[PDB]
Amino acid sequence: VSIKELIEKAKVAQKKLEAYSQEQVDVLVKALGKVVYDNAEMFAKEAVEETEMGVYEDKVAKCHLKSGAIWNHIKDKKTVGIIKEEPERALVYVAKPKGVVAATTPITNPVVTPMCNAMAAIKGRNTIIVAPHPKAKKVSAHTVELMNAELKKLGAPENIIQIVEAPSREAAKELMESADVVIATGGAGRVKAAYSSGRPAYGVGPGNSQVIVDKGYDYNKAAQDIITGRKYDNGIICSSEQSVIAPAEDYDKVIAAFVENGAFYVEDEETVEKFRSTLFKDGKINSKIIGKSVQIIADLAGVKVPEGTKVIVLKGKGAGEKDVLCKEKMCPVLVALKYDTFEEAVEIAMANYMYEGAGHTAGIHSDNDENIRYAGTVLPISRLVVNQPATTAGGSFNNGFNPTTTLGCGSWGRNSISENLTYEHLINVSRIGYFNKEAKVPSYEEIWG
Amino acid sequence: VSIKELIEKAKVAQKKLEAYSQEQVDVLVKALGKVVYDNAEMFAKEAVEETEMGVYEDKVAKCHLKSGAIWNHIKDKKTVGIIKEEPERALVYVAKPKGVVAATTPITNPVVTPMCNAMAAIKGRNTIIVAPHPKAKKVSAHTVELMNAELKKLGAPENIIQIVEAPSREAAKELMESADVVIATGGAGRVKAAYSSGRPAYGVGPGNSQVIVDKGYDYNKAAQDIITGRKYDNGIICSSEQSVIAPAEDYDKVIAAFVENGAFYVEDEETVEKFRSTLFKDGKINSKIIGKSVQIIADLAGVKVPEGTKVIVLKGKGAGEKDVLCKEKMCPVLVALKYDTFEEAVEIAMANYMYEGAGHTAGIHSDNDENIRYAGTVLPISRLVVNQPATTAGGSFNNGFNPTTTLGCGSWGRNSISENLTYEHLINVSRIGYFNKEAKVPSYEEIWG
DSSP states (O other): OOHHHHHHHHHHHHHHTTOOOOOHHHHHHHHHHHHHHHHHHHHHHHHHHTTTTTOHHHHHHHHHHHHHHHHHHHHOOOOSSEEEGGGGGGGEEEOOOEEEEEEESSSSSTHHHHHHHHHHHHHHHEEEEEEEOOGHHHHHHHHHHHHHHHHTTOOOOOTTTEEEOOHHHHHHHHHHHHEEEEESSHHHHHHHHHHHSSOOOOEOOOOBBEEEEEEHHHHHHHHHHHHHHHGGGTTOOOOSSOEEEEEEHHHHHHHHHHTTTTTTEEEOOHHHHHHHHHHEEETTEEETTTTHHHHHHHHHHOOOOOOTTOOOEEEEESSSOOOOGGOOOSSEEEEEEEESHHHHHHHHHHHHHHHTTTTSSSEESSSOOHHHHHHHSSSOOOEESSSOGGGGGGTTTSSOOOOOOOBTTTTTTSSSOOOOGGGGGGGEEEEEEOSSSOOOOOOOHHEEE | HHHHHHHHHHHHHHHHTTTOOHHHHHHHHHHHHHHHHHHTTHHHHHHHHTOOSOOOHHHHHHHHHHHHHHHHHHHHHHHOHHHEEEGGTTTEEEEEEEEEEEEEOOSSSSSSSHHHHHHHHTTTEEEEEOOOOOHHHHHHHHHHHHHHHHHHHOOOTTTSEEOSSSOOOOHHHHHHHHHHHHHHSSOOOHHHHHSSSSOOOEEOOOOOOOEEEESSHHHHHHHHHHHHHHHHGGGTTTBBBOEEEEEEHHHHHHEEEEHHHTTTEOOOHHHHHHHHHEEEEEEEEOOGTTTTOEEEEEHHHHHHOOTOOEEEEEEOSSSGOGGGGOOOSSSSEEEEEEEESSSHHEEEEHHHHHHHHTTTTEEOOOSOHHHHHHHHHOOOEEEESSOOGGGGGEEEETTTTOOOOOOEEEEEETSSSSBOOOOGEEEEEEOOOOSSSSOOOOOHHHHHH
């Protein structure tokens, strides 16, 4: 099945799907997330043992959280036909499909990403063609199979969800250039290909979530939240915490709070280098430790780490490019940096985002809202996460971030949107704009007064 | 001055401009539009006589309308720092610059487009580098010169607005690939280059505004509005009317209303072909008649057209690809098509958008709001214009369309947005997202009930 065949099958199905009503669309979208929720144990076991990375229980919770939070958010959203009337502007808003969606899915979330993109596309009467990551093509195609089985039970049009099993680089390039809109969730090489296809694209970016712990905050609570997000799925989540920027006044208190909650702190220079020379090879992350457990990393580094350790905290030689450990670490390892005062703490996180990860996510644990707002104003980020694990940046029942699996990084990460990808970005919103007669034309003084 | 120098000067100026407040930004933006308003007579005379297309008085009104309507819309908009608080979602919205903007400007609007893009960029503390069309580089650089003169009077940072005078295709390609965000207002070749640069881009599309006149409407009013938009600037406006889809019941009444208001109607097959073989060469528009007067087109066609004629109405052989006249005509010429009933009138316009211009603008003249809403729901357009000239789709004091010079065509025209380009698209909007504790976690029945 060539790409031109997949595109033609998707365009035919979309024209059939365009005749669907708001209710008939929502029926299909709800079942897409429910089948991922009901088969979470099977998908998580296959994804972990095929991609050779991640934690089984964490992917089960990921399938449960993503599928439920997405449908809970989009169940009452109007995305078909006329959706909003603004008489004060003499405007009527109409929601129209964009057409055929091409979605390249990653290896880290090979189940919830094909689900999220398909739910967001079908929500706006669009069809989707999935191109999975090669090391995850089996579990990603199995998710599409279980989703298409439920769509067939509901009499949905065939081929509204398609899969490109094992495509070449030219095939994925042929797919993105042929589709009406592109979604690229993965490495910077796949994202740059999306914005080079001559088509409007939605991409992601490399993460590097910096975490500021403010003076006086509950260090035990901050430690628990940061450890929970760092070890989540063995640390392959893009928004996962990467550093702990702690005040030098209470530095021993912050570290002891991490050690109390299952962290192994390393201060010795030679011992940290045993981890640094293992995690990074010529400034690049070692692919053999991506998504691996703490004991796997500890054995390869030759350092004794006690059993039950959740994360590894390493004292960094400095901020920014003073230490390769300040880059994105796709493994349960945190770099520890001390700061003098808050503006410098913002500067320390600023230098790490210039090193890698600008435009993604940051985390802060503080009761000082003047400090939280100052951090949110200066840092080059799309999402600031306050007093909770940074891994919740993709949507939670306790925060206001839009649930998604595609976190846009804005212009910093070379993306079109600096927000979470939802149904909104997969529909064209038009305007009917009437002739407002009651409005008075401003004069020269009324314009430039 | 190489492109790498222009980028470095723009990045330095943007970091200086980022320190500006909301008030200090609005001061610069107001002066950018005012200097184009105050020098409209000089800019319009130079643009007409350099690009060899358009009408002098129409470009004066264009400079007056665009500059005033844009500032009147963005004067009170918050685009610096924290701009919105949503306590019901525990969200705080922050507006951040995207960086350096690369804007390729067209030959048809070489004055208001460099102004609009610069006003929208500086509104969000961004800097802009303008790459003008070769046949309009003198008047486009003169606009940048007069704008930078006013910025210098106000002590603004130098080089927040730059110009690439006469760049090669490789130079414009080097500029778009180097900037943080791209704006491409021009032909489909320049737009496709923007979305192929590996950067997030905002483009336009070829227009082909179809106009439906409903049964029973004021045919004299519809004729006046359609003629006004067709002859505007000798018909080079992208949203300008291209056809008159009239009911066959009152076809003679609609045509007589056009003739009464200064139109020359042609019904003879051989005489229409004299125009068709002149307007189009092998299906492509003849560049010698783009933006030219009615008498210029009439002389080249060898057809006697009376003096004082405003537009030329040509009876088409059929809808869609049955007549090359149903394509975009960048000249004061309309194609006339009769329809049986309203659903077919929507189908006739549908076939012309499939031929050319899908995703742009349509016009309708009707008192039946059920028909207006049916047309707005089905037609593949970003803007429907009701009971007024379609050239007002770029913003008017009597409609709710956002004032702009960059009209996005959505996924149909291979653009990222299906709306008018404003300050909103040139800023990154981030979220601070607090931890909502009062929210209750839904259970299985509460999620999938």
